[PDB]
């Protein structure tokens, strides 16, 4: 009935009275009061109402990047409607462009919802030009675009336009960090060479090209990473899967020399492999080499 609906409507508006008084009694921007209302509405689960309360919060708190992330993450993971989703990712980067995450998030949202490559690759260029305060942010959005460009590749096909495209992008990214980021921050942004690491792992595991991965890892080590044991062991593990023992052997021998932080670990890893598959004189050579390092 007209009245039966009127009441059912009103009845379902009592639960929000505290949340509305909380807002009313509070002064602008009412952050904590909107935060609770968001917390509450999200537990209820009405998509229309959740969209509204986030929208209400933005009329007074669009300046806060985290609110955009909270709103976007909800649409990404729950509503999953391309139209309503991408709109907020567009608005997020328009309000808080300085925030890298927003761009990165926008890119996945676009990929998730199958937006054309021509379109996605253009958004990425806009990100590169937004302007972030620090070098790590430039690396972060490069990691994003390279993971996107990687997911386009069909590594079943030995050679392809997408793989060619992927490699060129890595080369562009690595140059971009050496030219633009170095000149602007007197720093690379990627000290452990994650971008290069990421490439060597693809090149080895998915392109049957250990030789590039070796060339790469020598550059990594050359950029001040030989002192670390974990860096040696990352390379070792890569060779152990997609390479051979001779190279594992020569590497761990060089690692005991170069390792500063944790030589005992490296030594033990060597002694184990020779115990697991090497000759006796190899096991002996190892014992001497490890001892010699541990002597100092």
């Amino acid at each position: 009935s007209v009245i039966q609906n009127y009441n059912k409507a009103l009845q379902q508006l009592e639960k929000y009275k505290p949340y509305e008084e909380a807002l009313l009694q509070a002064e602008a921007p009412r952050l904590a009061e909107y935060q609770a209302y968001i917390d509450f509405e999200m537990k209820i689960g009405d998509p229309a109402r959740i969209q509204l309360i986030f929208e209400r919060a933005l009329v007074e708190n669009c300046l806060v990047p985290d609110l955009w992330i909270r709103y976007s993450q909800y649409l990404d993971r729950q509503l999953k409607v391309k139209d309503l989703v991408l709109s907020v990712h567009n608005r997020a980067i328009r309000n808080c462009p300085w925030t890298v995450a927003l761009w990165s998030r926008y890119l996945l949202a676009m990929e998730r919802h199958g937006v054309d490559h021509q379109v996605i690759s253009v958004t990425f260029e806009k990100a590169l030009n937004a302007g972030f305060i620090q070098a790590t942010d430039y690396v972060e959005i490069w990691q994003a675009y390279l993971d996107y460009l990687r997911r386009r590749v069909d590594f079943k096909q030995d050679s392809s336009k997408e793989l060619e495209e992927l490699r060129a992008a890595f080369t562009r990214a690595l140059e971009y960090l050496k030219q633009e980021v170095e000149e602007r921050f007197n720093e690379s942004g990627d000290p452990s060479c994650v971008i290069m690491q990421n490439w060597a792992r693809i090149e080895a595991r998915l392109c049957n090209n250990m030789q590039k991965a070796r060339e790469l890892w020598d550059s990594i080590m050359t950029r001040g990473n030989a002192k670390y044991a974990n860096m040696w062991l990352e390379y070792y593990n890569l060779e152990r899967a997609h390479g051979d023992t001779q190279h594992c052997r020569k590497a761990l021998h060089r690692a005991v020399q170069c390792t500063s932080d944790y030589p005992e670990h490296v030594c033990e890893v060597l002694l184990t492999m020779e115990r697991t598959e090497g000759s006796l004189e190899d096991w002996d050579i190892a014992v001497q080499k490890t001892e010699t390092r541990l002597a100092r």
Binding site: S159, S160, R214, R254
Partner: protein
């Protein structure tokens, strides 16, 4: 003068050849090779210009690789300015199209490299002797292990 499909197949496979120390590879100008690719229909995606005289590259013309004043040119980059093809691929490339008059092949040798992770790469440039030759070998460790700009 082999057929198109066999040039694509023989060269493609030969480019996958491993870099084993002491082996002899030869450089090929990107200008010539990128056109040879169009003519043989080398890349599956861009394969319409195959067998057309509008893209027949003619004999190997590494003129942009040799210096104007009579195996030269510094700062040349791999993939951008040239493609290293192995001894068999260079022989085949010479066998089909011929080597331009008044030109010697840009021959280079594969060597062990890297002070941290030993790896193989064709030594395009040299120091002034090879990076793998020793100081003891030079007067009568390696030059790289020692260090000299």
């Amino acid at each position: 003068a082999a057929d198109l499909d066999t040039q694509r197949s023989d060269i493609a496979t030969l480019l996958k050849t491993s870099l084993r120390k002491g082996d002899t590879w030869y450089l090929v100008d990107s200008r010539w090779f990128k056109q040879w690719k169009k003519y043989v229909g080398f890349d599956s995606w861009d394969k319409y210009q195959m067998g057309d005289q509008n893209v027949y590259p003619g004999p190997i013309d590494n003129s942009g690789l040799l210096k104007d004043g009579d195996s030269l040119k510094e700062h040349l980059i791999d993939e951008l300015d040239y493609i290293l093809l192995p001894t068999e691929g260079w022989n085949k490339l010479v066998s089909w199209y011929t080597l331009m008059e008044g030109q010697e092949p840009i021959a280079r040798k594969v060597v062990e490299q890297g002070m941290f992770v030993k790896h193989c790469k064709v030594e395009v440039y040299l120091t002034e002797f090879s990076k793998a030759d020793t100081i003891d070998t030079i007067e009568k460790s390696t030059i790289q292990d020692a260090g000299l700009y």
